[PDB]
Enzyme design. Sequence first.
Site, PDB file in Angstrom:
ATOM      1  N   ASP B 162       0.806  -1.214   0.000  1.00 22.13           N
ATOM      2  CA  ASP B 162       0.000   0.000   0.000  1.00 22.13           C
ATOM      3  C   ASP B 162       0.845   1.272   0.000  1.00 22.13           C
ATOM      4  O   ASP B 162       0.717   2.113   0.890  1.00 22.13           O
ATOM      5  CB  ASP B 162      -0.960   0.003   1.193  1.00 22.13           C
ATOM      6  CG  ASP B 162      -2.010   1.092   1.089  1.00 22.13           C
ATOM      7  OD1 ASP B 162      -2.336   1.495  -0.048  1.00 22.13           O
ATOM      8  OD2 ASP B 162      -2.504   1.548   2.142  1.00 22.13           O
ATOM      9  N   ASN B 398       6.518  -7.420   7.132  1.00 21.50           N
ATOM     10  CA  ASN B 398       5.311  -6.652   7.409  1.00 21.50           C
ATOM     11  C   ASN B 398       4.093  -7.259   6.721  1.00 21.50           C
ATOM     12  O   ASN B 398       4.015  -7.296   5.493  1.00 21.50           O
ATOM     13  CB  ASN B 398       5.486  -5.191   6.989  1.00 21.50           C
ATOM     14  CG  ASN B 398       4.235  -4.365   7.222  1.00 21.50           C
ATOM     15  OD1 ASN B 398       4.031  -3.819   8.306  1.00 21.50           O
ATOM     16  ND2 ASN B 398       3.395  -4.261   6.199  1.00 21.50           N
ATOM     17  N   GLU B 399       3.153  -7.736   7.530  1.00 29.37           N
ATOM     18  CA  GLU B 399       1.928  -8.374   7.046  1.00 29.37           C
ATOM     19  C   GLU B 399       2.130  -9.499   6.021  1.00 29.37           C
ATOM     20  O   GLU B 399       1.554  -9.455   4.934  1.00 29.37           O
ATOM     21  CB  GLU B 399       0.963  -7.323   6.486  1.00 29.37           C
ATOM     22  CG  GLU B 399       0.497  -6.308   7.514  1.00 29.37           C
ATOM     23  CD  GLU B 399      -0.566  -5.372   6.975  1.00 29.37           C
ATOM     24  OE1 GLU B 399      -0.810  -5.389   5.751  1.00 29.37           O
ATOM     25  OE2 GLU B 399      -1.160  -4.621   7.777  1.00 29.37           O
ATOM     26  N   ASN B 453      -1.040  -5.118  13.365  1.00 29.67           N
ATOM     27  CA  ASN B 453      -1.705  -4.095  12.564  1.00 29.67           C
ATOM     28  C   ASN B 453      -3.210  -4.323  12.580  1.00 29.67           C
ATOM     29  O   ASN B 453      -3.714  -5.190  11.868  1.00 29.67           O
ATOM     30  CB  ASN B 453      -1.214  -4.145  11.118  1.00 29.67           C
ATOM     31  CG  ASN B 453       0.201  -3.639  10.962  1.00 29.67           C
ATOM     32  OD1 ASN B 453       0.849  -3.256  11.936  1.00 29.67           O
ATOM     33  ND2 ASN B 453       0.690  -3.634   9.729  1.00 29.67           N
ATOM     34  N   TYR B 455      -7.295  -2.741  12.480  1.00 29.43           N
ATOM     35  CA  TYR B 455      -8.153  -1.647  12.043  1.00 29.43           C
ATOM     36  C   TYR B 455      -9.627  -1.897  12.361  1.00 29.43           C
ATOM     37  O   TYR B 455     -10.495  -1.669  11.517  1.00 29.43           O
ATOM     38  CB  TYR B 455      -7.988  -1.406  10.542  1.00 29.43           C
ATOM     39  CG  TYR B 455      -6.617  -0.915  10.124  1.00 29.43           C
ATOM     40  CD1 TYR B 455      -6.330   0.445  10.074  1.00 29.43           C
ATOM     41  CD2 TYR B 455      -5.615  -1.809   9.767  1.00 29.43           C
ATOM     42  CE1 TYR B 455      -5.083   0.899   9.687  1.00 29.43           C
ATOM     43  CE2 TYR B 455      -4.364  -1.362   9.378  1.00 29.43           C
ATOM     44  CZ  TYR B 455      -4.104  -0.008   9.340  1.00 29.43           C
ATOM     45  OH  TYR B 455      -2.860   0.441   8.954  1.00 29.43           O
ATOM     46  N   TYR B 459     -11.637  -1.100   8.720  1.00 29.87           N
ATOM     47  CA  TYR B 459     -11.739  -2.171   7.730  1.00 29.87           C
ATOM     48  C   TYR B 459     -12.794  -3.194   8.144  1.00 29.87           C
ATOM     49  O   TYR B 459     -13.671  -3.551   7.357  1.00 29.87           O
ATOM     50  CB  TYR B 459     -10.382  -2.844   7.514  1.00 29.87           C
ATOM     51  CG  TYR B 459      -9.401  -1.992   6.736  1.00 29.87           C
ATOM     52  CD1 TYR B 459      -9.818  -1.243   5.642  1.00 29.87           C
ATOM     53  CD2 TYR B 459      -8.062  -1.930   7.099  1.00 29.87           C
ATOM     54  CE1 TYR B 459      -8.928  -0.463   4.927  1.00 29.87           C
ATOM     55  CE2 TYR B 459      -7.165  -1.149   6.392  1.00 29.87           C
ATOM     56  CZ  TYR B 459      -7.604  -0.419   5.308  1.00 29.87           C
ATOM     57  OH  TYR B 459      -6.715   0.359   4.601  1.00 29.87           O
ATOM     58  N   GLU B 492       0.167  -0.550  13.684  1.00 27.57           N
ATOM     59  CA  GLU B 492      -0.703   0.173  12.762  1.00 27.57           C
ATOM     60  C   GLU B 492      -2.139   0.205  13.265  1.00 27.57           C
ATOM     61  O   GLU B 492      -2.736  -0.836  13.539  1.00 27.57           O
ATOM     62  CB  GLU B 492      -0.687  -0.453  11.365  1.00 27.57           C
ATOM     63  CG  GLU B 492       0.547  -0.159  10.533  1.00 27.57           C
ATOM     64  CD  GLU B 492       0.402  -0.640   9.105  1.00 27.57           C
ATOM     65  OE1 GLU B 492      -0.749  -0.762   8.635  1.00 27.57           O
ATOM     66  OE2 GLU B 492       1.436  -0.903   8.455  1.00 27.57           O
ATOM     67  N   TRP B 537      -0.935   4.602  12.345  1.00 28.81           N
ATOM     68  CA  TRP B 537      -0.745   4.638  10.908  1.00 28.81           C
ATOM     69  C   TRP B 537      -1.669   5.715  10.362  1.00 28.81           C
ATOM     70  O   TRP B 537      -2.887   5.600  10.485  1.00 28.81           O
ATOM     71  CB  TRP B 537      -1.102   3.286  10.293  1.00 28.81           C
ATOM     72  CG  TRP B 537      -0.668   3.151   8.869  1.00 28.81           C
ATOM     73  CD1 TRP B 537      -1.458   3.214   7.758  1.00 28.81           C
ATOM     74  CD2 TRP B 537       0.667   2.937   8.401  1.00 28.81           C
ATOM     75  NE1 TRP B 537      -0.696   3.048   6.627  1.00 28.81           N
ATOM     76  CE2 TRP B 537       0.612   2.876   6.995  1.00 28.81           C
ATOM     77  CE3 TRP B 537       1.905   2.789   9.036  1.00 28.81           C
ATOM     78  CZ2 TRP B 537       1.747   2.674   6.212  1.00 28.81           C
ATOM     79  CZ3 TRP B 537       3.029   2.588   8.257  1.00 28.81           C
ATOM     80  CH2 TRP B 537       2.943   2.531   6.861  1.00 28.81           C
ATOM     81  N   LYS B 556      -4.539   8.244   6.144  1.00 30.42           N
ATOM     82  CA  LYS B 556      -4.609   7.827   7.541  1.00 30.42           C
ATOM     83  C   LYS B 556      -3.625   8.601   8.414  1.00 30.42           C
ATOM     84  O   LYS B 556      -3.470   8.309   9.599  1.00 30.42           O
ATOM     85  CB  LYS B 556      -4.369   6.322   7.679  1.00 30.42           C
ATOM     86  CG  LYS B 556      -5.477   5.450   7.099  1.00 30.42           C
ATOM     87  CD  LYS B 556      -5.343   4.012   7.585  1.00 30.42           C
ATOM     88  CE  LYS B 556      -6.450   3.123   7.037  1.00 30.42           C
ATOM     89  NZ  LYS B 556      -6.338   2.933   5.566  1.00 30.42           N
TER      90      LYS B 556
HETATM   91 MG    MG Z   1      -8.288  -1.586  15.732  1.00 29.65          MG
END
Ligand code: MG
Lengths: 587, 587
Positions: B162, B398-399, B453, B455, B459, B492, B537, B556
């Site tokens: 991203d 990362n991820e 991470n 969200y 998300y 994040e 993030w 963000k």
């Molecule tokens: Mg969260």
Amino acid sequence: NAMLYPLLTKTRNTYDLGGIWNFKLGEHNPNELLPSDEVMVIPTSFNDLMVSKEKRDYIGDFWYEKVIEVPKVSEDEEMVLRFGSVTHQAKIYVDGVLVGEHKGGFTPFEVLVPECKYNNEKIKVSICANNVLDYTTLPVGNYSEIIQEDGSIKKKVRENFDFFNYAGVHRPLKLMIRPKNHIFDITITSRLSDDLQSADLHFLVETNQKVDEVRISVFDEDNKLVGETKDSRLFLSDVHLWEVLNAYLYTARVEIFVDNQLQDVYEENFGLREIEVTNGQFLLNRKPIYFKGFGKHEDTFINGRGLNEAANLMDLNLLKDMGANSFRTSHYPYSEEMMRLADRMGVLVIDEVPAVGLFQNNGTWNLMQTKAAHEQAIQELVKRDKNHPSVVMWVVANEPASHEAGAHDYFEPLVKLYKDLDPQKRPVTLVNILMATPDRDQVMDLVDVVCLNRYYGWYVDHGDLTNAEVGIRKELLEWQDKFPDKPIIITEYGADTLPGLHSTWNIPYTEEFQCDFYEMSHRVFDGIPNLVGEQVWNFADFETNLMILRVQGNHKGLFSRNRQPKQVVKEFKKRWMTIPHYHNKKN
Amino acid sequence: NAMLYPLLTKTRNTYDLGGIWNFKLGEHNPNELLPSDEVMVIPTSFNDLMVSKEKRDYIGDFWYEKVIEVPKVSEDEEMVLRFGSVTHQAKIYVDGVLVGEHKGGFTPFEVLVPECKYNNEKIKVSICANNVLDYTTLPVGNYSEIIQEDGSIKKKVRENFDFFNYAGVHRPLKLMIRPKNHIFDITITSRLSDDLQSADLHFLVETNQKVDEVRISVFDEDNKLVGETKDSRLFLSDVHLWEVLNAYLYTARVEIFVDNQLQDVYEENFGLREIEVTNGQFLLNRKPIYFKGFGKHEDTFINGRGLNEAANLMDLNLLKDMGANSFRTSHYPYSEEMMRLADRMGVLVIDEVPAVGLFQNNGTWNLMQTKAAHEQAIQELVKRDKNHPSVVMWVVANEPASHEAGAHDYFEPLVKLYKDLDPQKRPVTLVNILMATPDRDQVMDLVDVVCLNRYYGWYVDHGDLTNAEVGIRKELLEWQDKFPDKPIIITEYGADTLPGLHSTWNIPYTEEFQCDFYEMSHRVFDGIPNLVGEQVWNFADFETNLMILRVQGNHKGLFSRNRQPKQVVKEFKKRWMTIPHYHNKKN
Ligand SMILES: [Mg+2]
Ligand SMILES: [Mg+2]
Ligand SMILES: [Mg+2]
Ligand SMILES: [Mg+2]
């Protein structure tokens, strides 16, 4: 029974009940007095007037209540409550007694006030409104209930459509005094002569009881009498045709007599214009029309889906100035005021029932219990708008699952219902979704005009205008090849555009990209002979619910929600003032 | 190799080759003279300097070329080209002759200039950069080729990450004159006394040829001699520790002698501080630390991914002012200038290789051919940054698809490589993606710190903070239960927020919702004893590629891309200045 627009006449007293009403989100007993702790305006959506999200997201019963003073009502008169609309469902009470119901949030209905109250000083009117949508309602919603673990159940409506579920009494509420023996309905049809100079008019007046005489006086725009009849039929010479952006309206003054005296009188406007769909063309007054305009929404700041006549005139004035000529009532019948404005300004209107959301997340047509609501919606819309010369086409649905099994069986009687009820037999269409591309679609054979919502370059091939052009040109040729005689109209095409966002690199969401998107789209459209119309999505930015693809509502508007233009507006005006309303692309 | 930061010493003449180079997107013969028709700056990303989308989206070979005048080079000296980085791949040419090559766009490398040219007047340096990413590169990209049917091949990189695929020479290019027998690496370690008042220093000085004596002088911040040794070991008293937002740096002046004369001299900075992860806590100098800071990006307007030292200092000053104390080099090693700045300002740094995109759009680990690039990335990063007291933890990925079969076998030797190469044996972590819930994940057992991470509310449960709070609390408790002694850091968490967007109804994308999102997040975090850090993030908005979820890049950021604050910045400053740097939440 209430499809005649409320008028003030010699026999009809019409009072407006708008203003401040006592209000409550939740339960209420109509036998009890609603306090003035909370109030609400009629007409408007209640949602944006609520400060907290919790109250704005309320789903269920919500009440309006007010004590109205009873006007003088004579022996041979009756008193009714005429609602422009209540969104979505409504139960009406007079003095705690149920007097009427309605289902469907965008069509008018009247309710009879009991005769035993006509000599009372006051009557308390209670309006139980309901904003629940499910699989039995139009538009379609995804209803669910969760137990709060507090003892109560909290309702939720996940909309099956791309616009906010604004609710409330959106249109004027009238208190109507009218004769018991009154004019129930008026139908006006005409057959234009071969030279377009004469017209054979037919006035079908419906009554509830019988009269000795049905007299009809026809006046022109100079208020001059040009015709009279008592046999429901009239010939007229030296006629003036209703033209696109050049309207001409006559008025039919209908009078019913019993024993040589006036019983009831009403005035219904009408226009003289011919509509015919043939050979991949849309003909207005026997001339090829090219549709230029917008998909719209009854949406504005503060009022939400509530009526705003000033907004209507401002929008239509902008429409006229840009060189546009039409719009679609997406995705529900608009106010009668808007339809009458369109008649007066010569703006072509594609009329649409709230049949949006007929799409599972398949087996859509085993899930949709909308047949009853869909039939009534068609009945109500045609009866309400059949005399409008601005209405040129009907819409059975917007983006339904027309590729799934059972789709053709669902729509065939509904398309038929339009053709049977409409005395003008105007073309009917179905607004098609991308998933129902020519091969898979099984419903487009039923309609007269092919209407497509296409977003090549935004949803498909996002930000890729090069490959988007190939994709849109490819499918348009497929539609034109599958139905060589049916005209094609793009009813939706656009890109979300936030004011202030700019770039030199054709970046989606910027004002420049919106211009690039439309420029590419038009290059493709102009190469399709059967494409006789382009209506952008949308005229203006509008409110939606919470979805990650929605950046505080929808932003595909050419104008912002405050009616301020974006960069692309200047570009459309150049194109639309270059292309005439009467434009033949068969040459 | 080229791990050591370029310095100007009496034995090392370091010249900057920055400025304007002859430029070309496409094919070029380095035996030929690149004209000045197109020029490009070093250092910077070339992308935002292109006016057209076509040239900005270019994928493939692109050339830098310039004729450079040769300075004085003595008999015992050599001349090398030291690139801070070239993104992503590079072949280096001197007078048309291939002389060096490097893969990986975020690590330094040096290239020897042929000795036969040291007495030439000028040399022509050609840089063949390449921005292609695939399944063999870090970061991972989706490569593809399509013939334009003109006979030519058009390359396309679909990023598996991203952020925008900025490319070019992002970091300073140096022309270095150094002795043939020089110091090519210096490793500095230390053991702190029990009272933290003394320190046992160990030095490992590496030369490419034999030397008679290695003399090391240590100076404090007052530039005063506090120790000297010829045995690469030194005991210090009254030491001053390197502290969070209170840095103290010593300087090691390393001199090598041959035949009683100076052969080479270099100065390496270092800090005295202790790191230990134990009992669900992150210990700095034996005290519980609470991480407050940001996931960042090397991203500014104009320069893109190019080095901007002013931007580094501006960001770090904002970090300090808000009460923050740390950041993560997401998702690639940052400039050496940034690392050295963090050393000076006492800012904690989570150092990260470009191992992002290890996730197929299952079976990720049957398709990823990234093993060789991943091993090199770890080797280069550790060798470059091991002496930085600011670096407190390494990131292995990362991820990645850490829930799929084969993930554990992939990461076990890579985690081991960090432990083997790092002389300080600092904790290593893996930044976990939301799909890999505690039950599904099979890799977090390898790391020392759990980095998540998450969200919830953006998300998952978009715009539903009520259900979001339940979800994040539920999973955080699961992580704490599965790994009772591993510290947890949120690396994040955020919500896209466009400046100017406002609402009273907690609407996503508005500035108010960003505040609401973070307020809910922190309420949850404070109830988790093992959660020892929060990194938002992002620090600032940054550029990404074209996709419908991206409204002209990523928004963000707490700050806008121009480093102007959003509404939430004020809220973070309140919280971060109440929570101390040394904060024990075991109590
Ligand atoms: Mg969260
Ligand atoms: Mg108003
Ligand atoms: Mg399109
Ligand atoms: Mg705390």
